[PDB]
Amino acid sequence: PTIFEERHLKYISQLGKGNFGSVELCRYDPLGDNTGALVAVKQLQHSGPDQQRDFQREIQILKALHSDFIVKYRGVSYLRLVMEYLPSGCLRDFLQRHRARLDASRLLLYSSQICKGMEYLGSRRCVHRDLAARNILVESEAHVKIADFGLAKLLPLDKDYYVVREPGQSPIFWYAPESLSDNIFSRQSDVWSFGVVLYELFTYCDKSCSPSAEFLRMMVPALSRLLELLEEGQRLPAPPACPAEVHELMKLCWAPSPQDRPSFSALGPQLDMLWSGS
Numbered sequence: 001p002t003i004f005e006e007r008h009l010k011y012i013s014q015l016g017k018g019n020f021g022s023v024e025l026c027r028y029d030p031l032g033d034n035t036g037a038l039v040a041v042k043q044l045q046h047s048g049p050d051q052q053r054d055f056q057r058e059i060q061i062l063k064a065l066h067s068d069f070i071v072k073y074r075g076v077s078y079l080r081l082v083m084e085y086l087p088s089g090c091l092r093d094f095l096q097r098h099r100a101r102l103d104a105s106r107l108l109l110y111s112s113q114i115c116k117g118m119e120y121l122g123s124r125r126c127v128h129r130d131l132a133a134r135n136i137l138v139e140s141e142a143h144v145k146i147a148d149f150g151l152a153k154l155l156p157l158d159k160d161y162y163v164v165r166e167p168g169q170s171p172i173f174w175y176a177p178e179s180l181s182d183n184i185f186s187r188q189s190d191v192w193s194f195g196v197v198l199y200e201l202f203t204y205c206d207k208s209c210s211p212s213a214e215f216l217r218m219m220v221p222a223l224s225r226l227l228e229l230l231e232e233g234q235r236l237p238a239p240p241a242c243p244a245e246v247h248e249l250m251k252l253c254w255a256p257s258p259q260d261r262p263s264f265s266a267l268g269p270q271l272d273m274l275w276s277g278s
């Protein structure tokens, strides 16, 4: 169905928290015999008008999204958002656990898939606003999908950037400088963040060389310091054993001015080529 009755959705466990919402593992069990399919169900835990309306927009964004590389909308219940459940979890944990199996080629396959999904999102005029390996899900050994559209905004036809009034609440190390300074978000700031996702992929989300840990190594409010470092042209170093051509792609995504960063549609072919030569 595209409309699920709540009485048929049976709670199993919590999948995650964040942005005043929660994602739960539920079984859709209209027969009530534990034979129904599993689904991920997002609900708000706050009745305030601003976040209800936000959550409604999130449901409409995802509903209108159709891509092998984007978590699938399944329907709603009335208040709750019903999505496909991916038991393999987020790519961040997947990379940490299967490190020894996943070679460079594989990482480049994941990279190309995220890029393809972001190119599509771009065409819908959708800014994701929170790209990070924690928000990428694993469909299979050779298939990933972008998720968490809790902060995603649709760009008006007349603008190509979005300005957020309140400060961001995500780890600061995935933010573009223009986001840090002016809360400007666009498809090009998504490109910046995708640079960090590339870094996460090629460090297999290892905690010791995380964006977090590397900043503390490079060393006043942390946010200002981060802006300073990036202003000087300090960047994250090549992940250990990273192919040079991949690191250069990262640095391109980390171009100080948004209009100097490659598009996802330009990034895509490069990744596919690197993957075919690995």
Ligand SMILES: C[C@@H](NC(=O)c1c[nH]c2ncc(C3CC3)nc12)C(C)(C)O
Pocket: 015, 016, 017, 018, 023, 040, 071, 083, 084, 085, 086, 087, 088, 089, 090, 134, 135, 136, 137, 147, 148
């Ligand atoms: C991106 C968010 N996840 C989702 O929206 C999900 C949608 N279907 C899913 N299936 C499995 C998972 C496992 C990782 C738990 N997360 C999700 C969240 C931040 C809760 O992981």
